[PDB]
Amino acid sequence: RLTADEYLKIYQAAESSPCWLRLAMELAVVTGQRVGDLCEMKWSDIVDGYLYVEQSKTGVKIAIPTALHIDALGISMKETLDKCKEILG
DNA sequence: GTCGGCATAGTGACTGCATATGTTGTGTTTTACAGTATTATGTAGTCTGTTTTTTATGCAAAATCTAATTTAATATATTGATATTTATATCATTTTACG
DNA sequence: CCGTTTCGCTCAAGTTAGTATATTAAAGCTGAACGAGAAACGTAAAATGATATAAATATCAATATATTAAATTAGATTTTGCATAAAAAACAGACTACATAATACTGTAAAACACAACATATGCAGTCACTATGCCGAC
DNA sequence: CCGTTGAAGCCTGCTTTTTTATACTAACTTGAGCGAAACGG
CB A33 within 8 A of CB A49: no
HSE (side-chain half, CA atoms, 13 Å) at A87: 13
The technique by which this structure was obtained is: cryo-EM
A2 touches strand C (CB under 7 A): no
Whether A22 is a known active-site residue: answer no
Q: Give dist(CA A14, CA A81) in Å, integer.
A: 19
Whether A42 is a known active-site residue: answer no
How many residues in chain A?
89
Q: 3-class DSSP state for residue A15?
A: coil
* ∠ Cα A64 A70 A73 (to 5°): 145
**Pseudo-torsion of CA A47, A34, A29, A2, nearest 10°?**
170
Nucleotides of chain C in contact with protein CB (under 7 A) are 26-29
Q: Give dist(CA A43, CA A27) in Å, integer.
A: 14
Q: Give dist(CA A31, CA A29) in Å, integer.
A: 6
Resolution (A): 11.0
Cα-to-chain-centroid distance, residue A81: 8
Sequence letter at residue A8: L
Point out the nucleotide closest to A57 (alpha carbon to C1′).
C26
Q: Give dist(CA A6, CA A58) in Å, integer.
A: 29
Q: 3-class DSSP state for residue A1?
A: coil
